[PDB]
Design an enzyme around this catalytic site. Structure first.
Site, PDB file in Angstrom:
ATOM      1  N   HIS A 126     -90.082  -3.688 -77.128  1.00 34.70           N
ATOM      2  CA  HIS A 126     -89.469  -4.249 -78.365  1.00 34.70           C
ATOM      3  C   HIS A 126     -88.230  -5.078 -78.001  1.00 34.70           C
ATOM      4  O   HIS A 126     -87.694  -5.790 -78.896  1.00 34.70           O
ATOM      5  CB  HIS A 126     -89.246  -3.176 -79.438  1.00 34.70           C
ATOM      6  CG  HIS A 126     -88.120  -2.235 -79.179  1.00 34.70           C
ATOM      7  ND1 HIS A 126     -88.271  -0.866 -79.271  1.00 34.70           N
ATOM      8  CD2 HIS A 126     -86.833  -2.451 -78.851  1.00 34.70           C
ATOM      9  CE1 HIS A 126     -87.122  -0.281 -79.010  1.00 34.70           C
ATOM     10  NE2 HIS A 126     -86.229  -1.225 -78.742  1.00 34.70           N
TER      11      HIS A 126
ATOM     12  N   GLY B 121     -78.499  -0.108 -79.139  1.00 31.11           N
ATOM     13  CA  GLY B 121     -78.198  -0.427 -77.735  1.00 31.11           C
ATOM     14  C   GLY B 121     -78.661   0.660 -76.779  1.00 31.11           C
ATOM     15  O   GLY B 121     -78.643   0.388 -75.564  1.00 31.11           O
TER      16      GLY B 121
ATOM     17  N   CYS C 222     -81.678   2.214 -76.655  1.00 33.07           N
ATOM     18  CA  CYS C 222     -83.116   2.121 -76.310  1.00 33.07           C
ATOM     19  C   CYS C 222     -83.243   1.791 -74.815  1.00 33.07           C
ATOM     20  O   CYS C 222     -82.396   1.073 -74.274  1.00 33.07           O
ATOM     21  CB  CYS C 222     -83.866   1.146 -77.210  1.00 33.07           C
ATOM     22  SG  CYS C 222     -83.770   1.670 -78.941  1.00 33.07           S
TER      23      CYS C 222
HETATM   24  C1  LIG Z   1     -83.423   0.108 -79.797  1.00 30.05           C
HETATM   25  C2  LIG Z   1     -82.139  -0.550 -79.366  1.00 30.05           C
HETATM   26  O1  LIG Z   1     -81.243   0.122 -78.870  1.00 30.05           O
HETATM   27  N1  LIG Z   1     -82.039  -1.889 -79.537  1.00 30.05           N
HETATM   28  C3  LIG Z   1     -80.991  -2.708 -78.930  1.00 30.05           C
HETATM   29  C4  LIG Z   1     -80.214  -3.423 -80.004  1.00 30.05           C
HETATM   30  N2  LIG Z   1     -81.144  -4.247 -80.793  1.00 30.05           N
HETATM   31  S1  LIG Z   1     -80.480  -5.431 -81.711  1.00 30.05           S
HETATM   32  O2  LIG Z   1     -81.536  -5.974 -82.507  1.00 30.05           O
HETATM   33  O3  LIG Z   1     -79.756  -6.279 -80.816  1.00 30.05           O
HETATM   34  C5  LIG Z   1     -79.311  -4.672 -82.796  1.00 30.05           C
HETATM   35  C6  LIG Z   1     -77.953  -4.826 -82.562  1.00 30.05           C
HETATM   36  C7  LIG Z   1     -77.033  -4.232 -83.414  1.00 30.05           C
HETATM   37  C8  LIG Z   1     -77.458  -3.484 -84.494  1.00 30.05           C
HETATM   38  C9  LIG Z   1     -78.811  -3.358 -84.694  1.00 30.05           C
HETATM   39  F1  LIG Z   1     -79.242  -2.630 -85.747  1.00 30.05           F
HETATM   40  C10 LIG Z   1     -79.759  -3.929 -83.875  1.00 30.05           C
HETATM   41  C11 LIG Z   1     -82.207  -3.439 -81.412  1.00 30.05           C
HETATM   42  C12 LIG Z   1     -82.959  -2.695 -80.341  1.00 30.05           C
END
Ligand SMILES: *CC(=O)N1CCN(S(=O)(=O)c2cccc(F)c2)CC1
Ligand SMILES: *CC(=O)N1CCN(S(=O)(=O)c2cccc(F)c2)CC1
Lengths: 304, 304
Positions: free
Chosen positions: A41, A143, A145
């Protein structure tokens, strides 16, 4: 003496954590040999996440779109493939800190350490269990993941989990390192409800043994039971059925304490039926189910 | 989302752990620069431990009697001194893995990570608090002495604890890295009773804030209180007095949640008076007091 919710030392896994950026999405990657593993993802815009076609999204991505940073040094991506729900990024440099490692798919009830990371940097380590509904109860912000779950056998890290998802109920879902989700979960922002979070009976029993070994004995009663009688009570209280396999696994703790497994079952039965009456066991007012029999023997014997 | 009892990543401290042997006693040492720190009781025969005169015992010890092993390589001891209850062994080799570090003496209520070690080898990591009676509730078997407690600020390890003692009640006593015991405890096998283990009120409040942030809100009530009224209830329940300093420290959590500290106090007051009524908060049936306000902000904001 004393019995603590204890994680593996995280150093060997700290040495494997990198930052992966695709477009505007930054998350964590695991660098083992010349492969960086991360959730697929990473390629999605939060828009994409509503109904992503990952094969189609991936066509638009080249090696150079995957930005991999190990500390403050960039790794050259020379290949990329999707395996189930993970990407494998081939880099031109073998991780010099690669530990001896295995990928294992754990069963529900099995415990592991999580190294929570943000931007490829470790923030903390905690001990989890794979719940019977194939969720984990983690601590994961945006962040996190690509943060991984592991066990260590002396010098070999068995990677069992990679973090992908928070369900609307604030529980966590992820994959093994072959990219296969635990449970029925999918890497899509959709309605996904968890099933019953039942208690891991064999783990509770292990932890009652740990309590006896550490001098907490008030709950030991004059009763015994049978697997079938116990299991009737387990069913009623949303506890996993206890099998002969579980009894067999508790053998060493039974031996060391001189409390027959079925006697400890009868004690657990009274605790379920009567509650704790405001008392505690190893500083807990509820029955802990995130220690395996192997965890109890490890901590009580002091394996390194 | 989710909130876990979380230890610092242990890698930086793993890189400092050595085995120290004097005569037949093996325990752990901390190797920073060209000094190895360990409990001075390494020089005692368990006989000696009943009424040891460490200055007299130490006269009989030479550099070559202190066997220091870093993995499977021996370190040459070129000097030794006693500072309070620790020995400082000067070795001819600076630890190449020495992190940026400080020695800090923590206050009661302050939390830290322990890296439990045996024979200089890490077995696990868990999160502790310095109890108000200057004990810790650890997991320490024979061989674990010289295991250390630490906090990390980005890349600087603040060492705050070295393990020395189990009290007859199975609670733990140790020193800072200047060898000064926390509390009134001494490195002698004698009657040493702990004082009242009071609850760390400011930590409970921090953890109630963590619960609100993670969606656990059932305990929020319609009431407020005063520091003086709250403190009357705290006294009755063996909770530490809450000061304006504590209120000030909880300011950021109050701000983020929009719950006034004194409102959260009134909620804690009802929880003490009414109990949990079989309910849980962040998966706990009791009020957790081993998270500081700083821990809650760290984990909820995701510092690395
Ligand atoms: C699952 C995970 O940790 N991530 C990394 C961050 N992103 S994002 O789309 O950059 C994001 C940043 C800040 C706040 C969010 F809700 C999402 C999603 C996947
Ligand atoms: C405090 C601590 O961990 N140690 C190291 C072990 N020794 S000992 O005297 O060698 C010992 C070994 C086995 C069982 C014991 F009870 C003591 C004591 C100090």
């Amino acid at each position: 003496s004393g019995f603590r919710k204890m994680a593996f030392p995280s150093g060997k896994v700290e040495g494997c954590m990198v930052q992966v950026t695709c477009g505007t999405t930054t998350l964590n990657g695991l660098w083992l040999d010349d492969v960086v593993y991360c959730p697929r993802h990473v390629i999605c815009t939060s828009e994409d996440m509503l109904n992503p076609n990952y094969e189609d999204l991936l066509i638009r991505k080249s090696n150079h779109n995957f930005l991999v940073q190990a500390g403050n040094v960039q790794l050259r991506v020379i290949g990329h493939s999707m395996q189930n729900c993970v990407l494998k990024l081939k880099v031109d440099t073998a991780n010099p800190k690669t530990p001896k490692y295995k990928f294992v798919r754990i069963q529900p009830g099995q415990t592991f350490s999580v190294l929570a990371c943000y931007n490829g940097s470790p923030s903390g380590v905690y001990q989890c269990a794979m719940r019977p509904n194939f969720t984990i109860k983690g601590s994961f912000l945006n962040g996190s993941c690509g943060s991984v779950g592991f066990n260590i056998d002396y010098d070999c890290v068995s990677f069992c989990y990679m973090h992908h998802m928070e369900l609307p109920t604030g529980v966590h879902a992820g994959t093994d390192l072959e990219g296969n989700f635990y449970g029925p979960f999918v890497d899509r922002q959709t309605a996904q409800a968890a099933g019953t979070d039942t208690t891991i009976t064999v783990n509770v029993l292990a932890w009652l043994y740990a309590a006896v070994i550490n001098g907490d004995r008030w709950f030991l009663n004059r009763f015994t039971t049978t697997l079938n009688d116990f299991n009737l009570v387990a069913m009623k209280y949303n506890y996993e059925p206890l099998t002969q396999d579980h009894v067999d696994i508790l053998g060493p703790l039974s031996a060391q304490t001189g409390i027959a497994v079925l006697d400890m079952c009868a004690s657990l039965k009274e605790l379920l039926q009567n509650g704790m009456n405001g008392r505690t066991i190893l500083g807990s007012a509820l029955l802990e189910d995130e220690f395996t029999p192997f965890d109890v023997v490890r901590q009580c014997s002091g394996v390194t």
